Amino acid sequence: PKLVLDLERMAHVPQEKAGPLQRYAATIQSQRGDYNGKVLSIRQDDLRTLAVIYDQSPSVLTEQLISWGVLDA
Amino acid sequence: PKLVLDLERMAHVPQEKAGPLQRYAATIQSQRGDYNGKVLSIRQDDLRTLAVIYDQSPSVLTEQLISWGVLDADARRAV
Ligand SMILES: Nc1nc2c(ncn2[C@@H]2O[C@@H]3COP(=O)(O)O[C@H]4[C@@H](O)[C@H](n5cnc6c(=O)[nH]c(N)nc65)O[C@@H]4COP(=O)(O)O[C@H]3[C@H]2O)c(=O)[nH]1
Ligand SMILES: Nc1nc2c(ncn2[C@@H]2O[C@@H]3COP(=O)(O)O[C@H]4[C@@H](O)[C@H](n5cnc6c(=O)[nH]c(N)nc65)O[C@@H]4COP(=O)(O)O[C@H]3[C@H]2O)c(=O)[nH]1
Ligand SMILES: Nc1nc2c(ncn2[C@@H]2O[C@@H]3COP(=O)(O)O[C@H]4[C@@H](O)[C@H](n5cnc6c(=O)[nH]c(N)nc65)O[C@@H]4COP(=O)(O)O[C@H]3[C@H]2O)c(=O)[nH]1
Ligand SMILES: Nc1nc2c(ncn2[C@@H]2O[C@@H]3COP(=O)(O)O[C@H]4[C@@H](O)[C@H](n5cnc6c(=O)[nH]c(N)nc65)O[C@@H]4COP(=O)(O)O[C@H]3[C@H]2O)c(=O)[nH]1
């Protein structure tokens, strides 16, 4: 199920909560030279990486991304 | 050292030589829904995959793609 991230909502999620997601997204945009401001799709196994970054389980990370509306159900 | 395949050029290579590469590209394009039909950039690690499909070393495989005009000569530095 596509990990397609809304960078708009991402940009307005409280940092307190979303700073590591934003910095991860940013290193991918930089690697890619992909600077569109709207959407970032990322690899399925990048979910596992973000989960480590947040020290959460994938499933928890997922629910939290949905809740900020950065990912869709 | 980007691996960028030239699709127009690929389509001209005879199937008995380039067929496994053409099916690989079409499989990636399908997986992506990417039908620009001009260029296909692929992962560094996908060189390994094509080399396995061709039963060639990565060096041999890359030389072949350059000879077909499908990879620019850059790609040498990827192995
Ligand atoms: N997931 C995703 N990422 C996207 C999309 N559009 C653009 N990008 C990203 O944005 C970078 C720059 O895109 P571009 O310069 O406007 O424009 C491109 C594009 O015109 C062309 N290009 C190179 N390779 C490919 C390819 O495999 N497919 C397509 N459709 N275009 C490519 O070369 C430039 C740079 O390509 P890249 O190195 O791939 O780098 C791309 C890629 O990382 C998209 O629809 N989905
Ligand atoms: N810049 C960017 N746009 C994104 C991203 N995710 C989704 N999109 C948008 O959603 C469509 C499909 O993205 P996709 O699943 O990456 O699937 C894309 C992707 O696989 C590929 N693609 C398009 N442009 C590029 C490119 O510049 N470089 C590469 N490497 N692939 C590309 O073509 C497929 C279809 O592209 P489109 O339908 O025309 O247009 C896109 C694009 O408008 C993203 O991370 N970055
Ligand atoms: N080995 C290999 N497999 C490929 C390739 N292109 C597509 N696939 C497979 O096709 C899936 C969908 O690709 P996408 O629609 O462009 O959907 C892509 C896409 O938009 C984006 N994406 C992943 N990696 C890159 C990348 O290196 N550059 C760019 N610009 N976008 C990426 O995240 C998505 C989800 O990625 P995955 O979960 O890996 O999901 C990928 C992957 O399993 C390829 O060049 N090589
Ligand atoms: N549409 C589509 N294109 C794909 C996909 N996978 C690879 N590509 C294309 O192949 C190029 C090289 O992929 P790479 O060697 O994995 O080299 C990639 C890679 O190591 C890293 N990277 C980019 N996006 C992602 C991502 O979403 N996840 C991860 N884990 N790494 C990424 O940055 C490098 C440069 O990325 P780009 O300049 O976009 O350059 C990408 C791109 O144009 C895919 O799944 N979908």
Numbering used by the authors:
A (entry chain B): 83 to 155
B (entry chain N): 83 to 161
Question: What does the article say, verbatim?
Answer:
Here, we report that c-di-GMP can assemble into a tetramer that mediates the effective dimerization of a transcription factor, BldD, which controls the progression of multicellular differentiation in sporulating actinomycete bacteria. BldD is an 18 kDa DNA-binding protein consisting of two distinct domains connected by a flexible linker. BldD sits at the top of the regulatory cascade controlling development, serving to repress expression of sporulation genes during vegetative growth (den Hengst et al., 2010). Specifically, structural and biochemical analyses show that the second messenger c-di-GMP activates BldD DNA binding by driving a unique form of dimerization that is mediated by a tetrameric form of c-di-GMP.
To elucidate the molecular basis for c-di-GMP recognition and binding by the BldD CTD and to gain insight into how this interaction may elicit developmental signaling, we determined structures of the S. venezuelae BldD CTD (residues 80–166) and S. coelicolor BldD CTD (residues 80–167) in complex with c-di-GMP. The BldD CTD uses a previously unseen mode of c-di-GMP binding in which two noninteracting CTDs are glued together by a c-di-GMP tetramer composed of two interlocked c-di-GMP dimers. The BldD CTD interacts with c-di-GMP using two contiguous surface motifs, herein called motif 1 and motif 2, which are located between the two β-α-α repeats. Motif 1 is composed of residues 114–116 (RGD) and motif 2 is composed of residues 125–128 (RQDD). Specifically, motif 2 from each CTD protomer combine to mediate contacts to one intercalated c-di-GMP dimer, Asp116 of motif 1 from each protomer combine to mediate contacts to the other c-di-GMP dimer, while Arg114 sits centrally and anchors both dimers. Arg114 is the only CTD residue that makes contacts to both intercalated c-di-GMP dimers. By sharp contrast, the BldD-bound tetrameric c-di-GMP is a tightly packed structure that is not secured by ions. Notably, the identical CTD dimer-(c-di-GMP) tetramer structure was seen in multiple crystal forms.
